[PDB]
Specification:
about 220 residues, mainly alpha, about 65% helix, signaling protein, Dbl-homology, helical bundle, Bcr-Abl
Length: about 220
């Protein structure tokens, strides 16, 4: 048995609302993220055919996990879809979140070479037209660089877009936890994944924006 349909619906609705917020943000994000791995596949082969625009060493440091991060998120998300209309018969959700926390070490490996990646990327744009064009056509929202004393956006900014959202995705674990009863083991599980996910970004707080107003000077 379980509770009546009229009682469980209150929980189904609310849970669906929060989970759907992730499927919704990830769906649209994943679609745009795929546009990056799309040319990456043939470019990986290009590293061993004729003479490509950039060397594999210059590609691999930037694209270190670009396609992996797409699959890691879509596996979680695409498997969430059927599950919203098929809440398990006598089980809860948490292992899907645990998987994201499990592989968090790769997110650090990328940050461990963030500077090195931008250092090559900035040079790659001036050094090659095909890298310059994609770096100009940078798929993004409106900017405040067409009238300001600043200049165009660099590779650092494009990599920082997903990173900012990933720092905010820890809040969903904190929100979910609040609604979950403490008496159930589901509470400390959500708490545990939140501990490592928050500490990871907090340990690089000054790395990913040292101060609120930091821009280059002449």
């Amino acid at each position: 048995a379980m509770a009546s349909e009229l009682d469980l619906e209150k929980g189904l609705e609310m849970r669906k609302w929060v989970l759907s917020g992730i499927l919704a943000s990830e769906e649209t994000y994943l679609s745009h993220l795929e546009a990056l791995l799309l040319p990456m596949k043939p470019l990986k082969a290009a590293a061993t055919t004729s003479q490509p625009v950039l060397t594999s060493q210059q590609i691999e440091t930037i694209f270190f996990k670009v396609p992996e991060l797409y699959e890691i998120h879509k596996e979680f998300y695409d498997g969430l879809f059927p599950r919203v209309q098929q809440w398990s018969h006598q089980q809860r959700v948490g292992d899907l979140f645990q998987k994201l926390a499990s592989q968090l070490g790769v997110y650090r490996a990328f940050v461990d070479n963030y500077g090195v990646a931008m250092e090559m990327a900035e040079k790659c744009c001036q050094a090659n037209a095909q890298f310059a064009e994609i770096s100009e056509n940078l798929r993004a929202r409106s900017n405040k660089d067409a009238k300001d004393p600043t200049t165009k956006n660099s590779l650092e900014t494009l990599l920082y877009k997903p990173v900012d959202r990933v720092t905010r995705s820890t809040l969903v674990l904190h929100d979910l936890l609040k609604h979950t009863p403490a008496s159930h083991p589901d509470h400390p599980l959500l708490q545990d994944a939140l501990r490592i996910s928050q500490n990871f970004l907090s340990s690089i707080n000054e790395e990913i924006t040292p101060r609120r107003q930091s821009m280059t000077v002449k």
